[PDB]
Design a protein around this motif. Structure first.
Motif, PDB file in Angstrom:
ATOM      1  N   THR A   1       2.210  18.146 -12.123  1.00  8.84           N
ATOM      2  CA  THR A   1       2.204  16.832 -11.484  1.00  8.84           C
ATOM      3  C   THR A   1       1.273  15.852 -12.190  1.00  8.84           C
ATOM      4  OG1 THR A   1       0.523  17.224  -9.754  1.00  8.84           O
ATOM      5  CG2 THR A   1       2.782  17.994  -9.272  1.00  8.84           C
ATOM      6  N   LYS A   2       0.678  16.291 -13.293  1.00  6.59           N
ATOM      7  CA  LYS A   2       0.026  15.388 -14.281  1.00  6.59           C
ATOM      8  C   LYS A   2       1.069  14.406 -14.849  1.00  6.59           C
ATOM      9  CE  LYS A   2      -3.550  16.545 -16.858  1.00  6.59           C
ATOM     10  NZ  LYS A   2      -5.027  16.367 -16.730  1.00  6.59           N
ATOM     11  N   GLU A   3       2.253  14.922 -15.181  1.00  4.57           N
ATOM     12  CA  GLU A   3       3.314  14.110 -15.788  1.00  4.57           C
ATOM     13  C   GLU A   3       4.225  13.441 -14.784  1.00  4.57           C
ATOM     14  OE1 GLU A   3       3.892  17.601 -17.919  1.00  4.57           O
ATOM     15  OE2 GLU A   3       1.828  16.874 -18.508  1.00  4.57           O
ATOM     16  N   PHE A   4       4.614  14.173 -13.760  1.00  4.65           N
ATOM     17  CA  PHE A   4       5.510  13.604 -12.778  1.00  4.65           C
ATOM     18  C   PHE A   4       5.038  13.903 -11.362  1.00  4.65           C
ATOM     19  CE2 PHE A   4       7.929  14.349 -16.659  1.00  4.65           C
ATOM     20  CZ  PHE A   4       8.377  13.057 -16.951  1.00  4.65           C
ATOM     21  N   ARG A   5       5.141  12.900 -10.504  1.00  6.25           N
ATOM     22  CA  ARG A   5       4.748  13.040  -9.113  1.00  6.25           C
ATOM     23  C   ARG A   5       5.175  11.782  -8.367  1.00  6.25           C
ATOM     24  NH1 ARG A   5       1.376  15.306  -5.249  1.00  6.25           N
ATOM     25  NH2 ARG A   5       1.043  17.180  -6.574  1.00  6.25           N
ATOM     26  N   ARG A   6       5.992  11.995  -7.344  1.00  2.87           N
ATOM     27  CA  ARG A   6       6.592  10.915  -6.586  1.00  2.87           C
ATOM     28  C   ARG A   6       5.608  10.394  -5.533  1.00  2.87           C
ATOM     29  NH1 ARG A   6       9.953   6.885  -6.862  1.00  2.87           N
ATOM     30  NH2 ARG A   6      11.229   6.553  -4.938  1.00  2.87           N
ATOM     31  N   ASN A   7       4.773  11.293  -5.029  1.00  6.47           N
ATOM     32  CA  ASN A   7       3.956  11.070  -3.825  1.00  6.47           C
ATOM     33  C   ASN A   7       2.506  11.493  -4.030  1.00  6.47           C
ATOM     34  OD1 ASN A   7       6.740  12.715  -2.947  1.00  6.47           O
ATOM     35  ND2 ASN A   7       6.465  10.692  -1.981  1.00  6.47           N
ATOM     36  N   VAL A   8       1.557  10.747  -3.477  1.00  7.42           N
ATOM     37  CA  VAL A   8       0.106  11.098  -3.542  1.00  7.42           C
ATOM     38  C   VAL A   8      -0.319  12.324  -2.692  1.00  7.42           C
ATOM     39  CG1 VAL A   8      -0.865   9.571  -1.685  1.00  7.42           C
ATOM     40  CG2 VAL A   8      -2.192  10.084  -3.794  1.00  7.42           C
ATOM     41  N   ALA A   9       0.284  12.511  -1.520  1.00  3.89           N
ATOM     42  CA  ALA A   9       0.100  13.757  -0.749  1.00  3.89           C
ATOM     43  C   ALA A   9       1.359  13.946   0.062  1.00  3.89           C
ATOM     44  CB  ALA A   9      -1.150  13.681   0.135  1.00  3.89           C
ATOM     45  N   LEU A  10       1.585  15.122   0.641  1.00  2.00           N
ATOM     46  CA  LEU A  10       2.918  15.404   1.217  1.00  2.00           C
ATOM     47  C   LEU A  10       2.929  16.123   2.530  1.00  2.00           C
ATOM     48  CD1 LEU A  10       3.666  16.789  -2.062  1.00  2.00           C
ATOM     49  CD2 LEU A  10       5.284  15.195  -1.315  1.00  2.00           C
ATOM     50  N   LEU A  11       1.816  16.750   2.876  1.00  2.00           N
ATOM     51  CA  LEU A  11       1.801  17.680   4.034  1.00  2.00           C
ATOM     52  C   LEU A  11       0.867  17.193   5.112  1.00  2.00           C
ATOM     53  CD1 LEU A  11       1.343  20.472   1.518  1.00  2.00           C
ATOM     54  CD2 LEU A  11       3.565  20.147   2.573  1.00  2.00           C
TER      55      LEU A  11
ATOM     56  N   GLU B   1      13.038  12.225 -11.475  1.00  2.00           N
ATOM     57  CA  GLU B   1      14.311  11.572 -11.136  1.00  2.00           C
ATOM     58  C   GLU B   1      14.227  10.085 -10.783  1.00  2.00           C
ATOM     59  OE1 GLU B   1      16.344  13.544  -8.043  1.00  2.00           O
ATOM     60  OE2 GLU B   1      18.084  12.238  -7.935  1.00  2.00           O
ATOM     61  N   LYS B   2      13.132   9.656 -10.150  1.00  2.00           N
ATOM     62  CA  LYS B   2      13.108   8.333  -9.503  1.00  2.00           C
ATOM     63  C   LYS B   2      12.007   7.416 -10.028  1.00  2.00           C
ATOM     64  CE  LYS B   2      15.540   9.457  -5.201  1.00  2.00           C
ATOM     65  NZ  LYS B   2      15.521   9.508  -3.685  1.00  2.00           N
ATOM     66  N   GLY B   3      10.935   7.996 -10.552  1.00  2.00           N
ATOM     67  CA  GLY B   3       9.713   7.241 -10.840  1.00  2.00           C
ATOM     68  C   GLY B   3       8.477   7.894 -10.251  1.00  2.00           C
ATOM     69  N   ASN B   4       7.357   7.792 -10.951  1.00  2.00           N
ATOM     70  CA  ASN B   4       6.103   8.281 -10.398  1.00  2.00           C
ATOM     71  C   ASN B   4       5.597   7.288  -9.375  1.00  2.00           C
ATOM     72  OD1 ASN B   4       6.242  10.498 -12.170  1.00  2.00           O
ATOM     73  ND2 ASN B   4       4.880   9.481 -13.672  1.00  2.00           N
ATOM     74  N   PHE B   5       4.706   7.725  -8.476  1.00  2.00           N
ATOM     75  CA  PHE B   5       4.086   6.746  -7.584  1.00  2.00           C
ATOM     76  C   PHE B   5       3.224   5.837  -8.455  1.00  2.00           C
ATOM     77  CE2 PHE B   5      -0.386   8.101  -6.677  1.00  2.00           C
ATOM     78  CZ  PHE B   5      -0.392   9.463  -6.979  1.00  2.00           C
TER      79      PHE B   5
ATOM     80  N   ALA C   1       0.823  -1.217   0.000  1.00  2.00           N
ATOM     81  CA  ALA C   1       0.000   0.000   0.000  1.00  2.00           C
ATOM     82  C   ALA C   1       0.850   1.257   0.000  1.00  2.00           C
ATOM     83  CB  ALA C   1      -0.915   0.018   1.189  1.00  2.00           C
ATOM     84  N   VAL C   2       1.978   1.206   0.699  1.00  2.00           N
ATOM     85  CA  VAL C   2       2.851   2.363   0.813  1.00  2.00           C
ATOM     86  C   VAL C   2       3.615   2.559  -0.501  1.00  2.00           C
ATOM     87  CG1 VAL C   2       4.843   3.276   1.965  1.00  2.00           C
ATOM     88  CG2 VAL C   2       3.028   2.464   3.277  1.00  2.00           C
ATOM     89  N   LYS C   3       3.990   1.456  -1.124  1.00  2.00           N
ATOM     90  CA  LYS C   3       4.785   1.478  -2.365  1.00  2.00           C
ATOM     91  C   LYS C   3       4.033   2.105  -3.522  1.00  2.00           C
ATOM     92  CE  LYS C   3       8.688  -1.706  -2.115  1.00  2.00           C
ATOM     93  NZ  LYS C   3       9.259  -2.951  -1.505  1.00  2.00           N
ATOM     94  N   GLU C   4       2.727   1.875  -3.526  1.00  2.00           N
ATOM     95  CA  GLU C   4       1.864   2.313  -4.593  1.00  2.00           C
ATOM     96  C   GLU C   4       1.480   3.782  -4.449  1.00  2.00           C
ATOM     97  OE1 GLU C   4      -1.431  -0.422  -4.045  1.00  2.00           O
ATOM     98  OE2 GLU C   4      -0.717  -1.602  -5.814  1.00  2.00           O
ATOM     99  N   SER C   5       1.375   4.267  -3.216  1.00  2.00           N
ATOM    100  CA  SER C   5       0.965   5.655  -2.957  1.00  2.00           C
ATOM    101  C   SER C   5       2.113   6.626  -2.586  1.00  2.00           C
ATOM    102  CB  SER C   5      -0.156   5.707  -1.917  1.00  2.00           C
ATOM    103  OG  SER C   5      -1.385   5.236  -2.446  1.00  2.00           O
ATOM    104  N   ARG C   6       3.068   6.161  -1.779  1.00  2.00           N
ATOM    105  CA  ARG C   6       4.204   6.973  -1.301  1.00  2.00           C
ATOM    106  C   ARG C   6       3.738   8.296  -0.646  1.00  2.00           C
ATOM    107  NH1 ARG C   6       8.745   4.456  -3.093  1.00  2.00           N
ATOM    108  NH2 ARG C   6       9.850   6.052  -1.892  1.00  2.00           N
ATOM    109  N   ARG C   7       2.655   8.231   0.117  1.00  2.00           N
ATOM    110  CA  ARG C   7       2.187   9.345   0.929  1.00  2.00           C
ATOM    111  C   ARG C   7       3.258   9.823   1.877  1.00  2.00           C
ATOM    112  NH1 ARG C   7      -3.228  10.809   1.982  1.00  2.00           N
ATOM    113  NH2 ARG C   7      -3.978   8.822   1.151  1.00  2.00           N
TER     114      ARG C   7
END
Ligand SMILES: Nc1nc2c(ncn2[C@H]2C[C@H](O)[C@@H](COP(=O)(O)OP(=O)(O)OP(=O)(O)O)O2)c(=O)[nH]1
Ligand SMILES: Nc1nc2c(ncn2[C@H]2C[C@H](O)[C@@H](COP(=O)(O)OP(=O)(O)OP(=O)(O)O)O2)c(=O)[nH]1
Ligand SMILES: Nc1ncnc2c1ncn2[C@@H]1O[C@H](COP(=O)(O)OP(=O)(O)O)[C@@H](O)[C@H]1O
Ligand SMILES: Nc1ncnc2c1ncn2[C@@H]1O[C@H](COP(=O)(O)OP(=O)(O)O)[C@@H](O)[C@H]1O
Ligand SMILES: [Mg+2]
Ligand SMILES: [Mg+2]
Lengths: 608, 624
Positions: free
Chosen positions: A466-476, A427-431, A372-378
């Motif tokens: 963040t349509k194209e790139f986004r590492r994390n589903v939410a951050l704050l 740099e790393k991959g999208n979630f 679950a964490v791997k797929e979302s990276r919240r």
């Protein structure tokens, strides 16, 4: 001012004797005899930065012939920020970073580190190497699922997590069970088993039951006043804050039902709210959890659903999701009457990377959590020291100035955190779940309400990127920061200082207040617990150095809403009420609460 | 008599109004709406006979030519013995047989039953079709295994099972936990979680916990239900020989308390330990003693497999994940002119062993390791009920060598034809998969009980040697409390003496609720002058015994003894007598008078150490 020059202002200010005692007491590693492997904060900072820098081992952007240089550069930044205490991760990261790992690898000087050393750290990480504060597991409506959840609670709690559940899947007391022995005992009777389990493992959990559950009234009285001393209880609200405000205003009725039951009932939505307020008025519980508001902003809704938060409210999470937190001490960012935003944005960038990197070196007890964490990276990046910062800027917490300041501060942070996520996505991959989220499938989706900064426009456009790139589903998020703010010698999360002097003296008050005026009054201040009715202290000192109970309940609630417009997860904030508050004052907090942008509510009356 | 003529004496005799309340309360199947699908014990016997007969589909000895006929015949014979109430399987068989099966099929006239109907019964038994009363689960020394075990308890409990565990693997309180320097909380601490769980699973409409005498937390355990684990029965476990322990006691020796996964060790005087137990038993009835050493002695699979615990009531030592389905023959019904009709009885044992072995085939368990274990061993628990009431007919005092000698012969007889049936069944259907590595194979002269009190021993040995070749089941016999099924059959429970000869159970007839219905033992009614019964009756209900009543014949005072007329040792010695001829264990309360001391409890324990009993439960009259 550059972060590196900021770091230099703080890197060598020693943690107070208060901080140092808490550290010795429970953060410093101890060998198999209870002897110290770490003796000061620097050892913790070195160990933690090194473990988390190890994740860079997995960066596809680097190569062999570059990784070690690049990795050591991250440990070095991580280390300096940590040692300076400008950012500190949630406690579990401090405790458990490097568990499994050969002691001679965790504290060896950075210059001496080889690519092999970093790899061995990476692989010697054991099952206790769990670095996240916040978990949510479901509790399905079957004895099998109930008891598997009890097992999960035990395993999460063992290794250091706080865990939350929505109990609403469990059919109410009395429902038919296809069997012999008869009837379902209901959500609440089962929460007692979770309480027993945890009381044993721990010799601090969240439990939600939705407002339309037939056992809601039993649930609301559940900690009155049998008990569930390990639970914080919140009433869940899966529907629109809108619908609920309106229903109340129109004195409507709420139908209590459950799908797997024939138990139905009608109650006046206002009687229920009064029931909640009366209990909260007495003892604090239950809180409210505006689950539907969380889902409104949930990039993965409705193909995933937030049903619960974590024990303190600040992360609303989908099933088997966990989240690691970290907090930036904004009080250290004061410079010449201003918040050094140059240095702040650099930290925000470093902080998001660190938090994303914790995911890759984290170990969870349950495979469904790992996945679950791997797929979302919240992530849960937040702030501490906010109150102390306002003292330095000479801004009274209970004022529109303070809240417009908060909203802008939080907007700035939100902007660069989300820009940092775009860049990590590159740099790393999208979630993994970017494709099915509203950052993609929708246009102009933003995961908080905004509407109280000039960064909105800019934020609204980073959100299109963040349509194209986004590492994390939410951050704050804004967390309680109970322990780490003590480590950082600063104020907790967004909260006002509860007191200026507590022998059980605030450093900014100590500077700004003329000594001897300070020496005179400090006894009276300890008793009365506020400057307000100490006579012959300057009106401007009185006005700025407000404590929690100097600030009225709506000023608390409006501070929460200001921060919440720019926070993609939720916020831990206590709405302190004076001892003389009435049950009607609580209802009023609740109604204001449904009109603002807050995702939940905790009240606490002084004296209760 | 042939069994057919005995079935005839009983088949149209209906349960008492007492039993009918019990049946209505918990045995009659109701439908999704709460309407009765059964209203007469006969409906139950139908449904249960039909389901267990379904196991005959799997019989590899039947050409498909004969199957429907063979299955309908077993259905009818099962139906007959159940309707007559000559044999009754443990309660979960009665509650759960046929769950999942379409309602048209369960009660429909047999002569309308096709082979497809039987196949359909078989395929449709759902996840709640759990027909066994007795379970043991391990609780390994880790958080995950502790909590996998709590989950097993809740799931077994939900479907009707009684479950036990030895908690001795958990490391003592305060002990070392790897990688934390935080300390283990201990077995008793986690037993509270098991208790909480079950107090909630059983909320509205039982458990065994065992800790071994050498565990460093044993003293804590002994006191755990002092003024609480209100849902547990507690026993102290002895995995060593009873000889070692008796000797150590006689020497006034010390015991070493140590644990494999702890540094905590302690030395305690065994006498002081035993006295702590005796005092607590003297006060509350807990803890009992569990001579696991002595169960392992007679376990065919030991040391390959091991018995570490029993179920709730103690009558089944079970290895890890093992279950056991029980059923009991009413021996009172086999009274034929001052003799026990052995001819009819032997046919009923043949039939009842096959029934109980058929339960295993239609049985669904909530956990795979349990299915497996059970399929591996095929442990049965065939026992008896109404033995006290049988003694009454034969005019034998319970508290006499005469009763004990008759009891050993009866049990010895039953055991003989029970294992001989397992023989026949093993030829007919296949041996239990583990026959090969069991002591029935790897030894000469293995007998799974002590014997030494019957003419029948020589023959038993014959039969046990025979089962080196053919054996359907690892063990076959038990005596159970029969708390419920003896009330259904209107007869005395297990091997236990009658607690009272006369009492009241008020009617609760609603609709103007009142009425005290006075019960008198049916055999007392038949052998005592209705003129006498007339006058003494009210003194009998005040005093609870016949003994100190003026003008009742001396021979009726001697025969119609109750549980408190019978002294502790005579309780103990009767248990011993049965256990000599039972391969599982025995459920027996050693009743003690209020006036009994802790030294009297101690002596019962020393005497049990010298007998062949497999464990001890004591109860002091006015403790609880
Ligand atoms: N206290 C208590 N609750 C039970 C018992 N059996 C079931 N329940 C409750 C647990 C869940 O909230 C709900 C459903 O339980 P299960 O799925 O385990 O029951 P089952 O699948 O046999 O029947 P169902 O198909 O779900 O109606 O009923 C029980 O024996 N005791
Ligand atoms: N109350 C309590 N007991 C615990 C805790 N952790 C372990 N124990 C007890 C449970 C078992 O009786 C025993 C061993 O537990 P585990 O196998 O789960 O611990 P772990 O493998 O981490 O350490 P180990 O290799 O067994 O020393 O310790 C705990 O966190 N709280
Ligand atoms: N005693 C605890 N046990 C388990 N989890 C906890 C505990 N205290 C806090 N947490 C978790 O961390 C979250 C926020 O922690 P605070 O912000 O309280 O963290 P810190 O300990 O890092 O200063 C809580 O909502 C909860 O999820
Ligand atoms: N209330 C109960 N809940 C679960 N299991 C029980 C309960 N009562 C008895 N048992 C189980 O049933 C077995 C037989 O008890 P009895 O012989 O008391 O059952 P019954 O007369 O209902 O067939 C016991 O050894 C125990 O394992
Ligand atoms: Mg179910
Ligand atoms: Mg372990």
């Amino acid at each position: 001012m550059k972060l590196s020059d900021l770091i230099s202002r703080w890197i060598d200010v020693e943690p107070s004797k208060n901080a140092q005692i808490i550290l010795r007491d429970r953060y410093f590693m101890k060998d198999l005899d209870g002897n110290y492997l770490e003796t000061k904060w620097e050892d913790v900072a070195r160990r933690v930065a090194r473990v988390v820098a190890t994740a860079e081992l997995l960066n596809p952007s680097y190569k062999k012939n570059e990784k070690l240089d690049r990795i050591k550069e991250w440990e070095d930044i991580f280390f300096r920020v940590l040692k300076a205490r400008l950012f500190i991760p949630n406690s579990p990261t401090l405790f458990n970073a490097g568990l499994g790992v050969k002691h001679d690898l965790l504290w060896k000087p950075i210059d001496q580190m080889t690519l092999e050393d970093y790899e061995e750290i990476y692989r010697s990480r054991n099952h206790l190497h769990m670095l996240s504060a916040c978990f949510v597991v479901p509790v399905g409506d079957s004895i099998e699922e109930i008891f598997e959840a009890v097992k999960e609670y035990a395993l999460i709690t063992k290794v250091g997590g706080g865990v939350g559940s929505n109990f609403s899947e469990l059919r109410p007391k009395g429902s038919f069970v296809a069997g012999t022995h008869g009837k379902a005992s209901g959500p609440v009777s089962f929460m007692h088993v979770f309480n027993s389990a945890i009381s044993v493992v721990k010799q601090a959990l969240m439990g939600i039951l939705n407002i339309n559950h037939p056992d809601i009234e039993e649930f609301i009285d559940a900690k009155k006043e049998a008990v569930l001393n390990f639970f914080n209880l919140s009433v869940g609200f899966p529907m629109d804050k809108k619908e609920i405000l309106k229903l109340y205003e129109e004195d409507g009725e709420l139908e209590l039902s459950h799908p797997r039951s024939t138990i139905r009932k009608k109650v006046k939505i206002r009687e229920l709210f009064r029931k909640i307020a009366t209990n909260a008025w007495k003892s604090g519980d239950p809180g409210l959890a505006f689950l539907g508001e969380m889902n409104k902003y949930y990039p993965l809704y409705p193909h995933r659903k937030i049903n619960s938060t974590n024990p303190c409210g600040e992360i609303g999470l989908s099933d088997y999701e966990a989240c690691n937190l970290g907090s930036i001490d904004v009080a250290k960012f004061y410079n010449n009457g201003f918040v050094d935003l140059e240095a702040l944005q650099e930290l925000v960038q470093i902080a998001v990377r660190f938090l994303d990197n914790v995911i890759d070196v984290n170990v969870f007890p349950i495979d469904k959590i790992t996945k679950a964490v791997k797929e979302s990276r919240r992530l849960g990046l937040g702030i501490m020291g906010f109150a102390d910062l306002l003292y330095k800027l000479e801004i009274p917490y209970n004022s529109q100035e303070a809240r417009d300041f908060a909203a802008n501060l939080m907007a700035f942070i939100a902007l660069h955190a989300h820009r940092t996520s775009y860049e990590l996505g590159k740099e790393k991959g999208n979630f993994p779940l970017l494709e099915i989220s509203r950052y993609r499938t929708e246009d102009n989706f933003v995961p908080f309400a905004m509407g109280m900064s000039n960064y909105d426009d800019e934020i609204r456009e980073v959100m299109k990127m963040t349509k194209e790139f986004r590492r994390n589903v939410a951050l704050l998020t804004i967390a309680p920061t109970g322990s780490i703010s003590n480590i950082a010698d600063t104020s907790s999360g967004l909260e006002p200082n509860f007191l200026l002097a507590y022998t059980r003296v605030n450093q900014v008050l100590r500077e700004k207040l003329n000594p001897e005026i300070l020496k005179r009054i400090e006894k009276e201040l300890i008793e009365k617990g506020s400057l307000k009715d100490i006579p012959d202290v300057p009106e401007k000192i009185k006005k700025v150095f407000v404590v929690a109970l100097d600030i009225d309940p709506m000023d608390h609630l409006l501070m929460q809403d200001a921060f919440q417009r720019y926070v993609d997860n939720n916020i831990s904030k206590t709405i302190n009420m004076p001892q003389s508050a009435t049950v009607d004052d609580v209802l009023n907090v609740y109604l204001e609460a449904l009109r603002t942008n807050v995702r939940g509510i905790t009240v606490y009356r002084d004296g209760s």
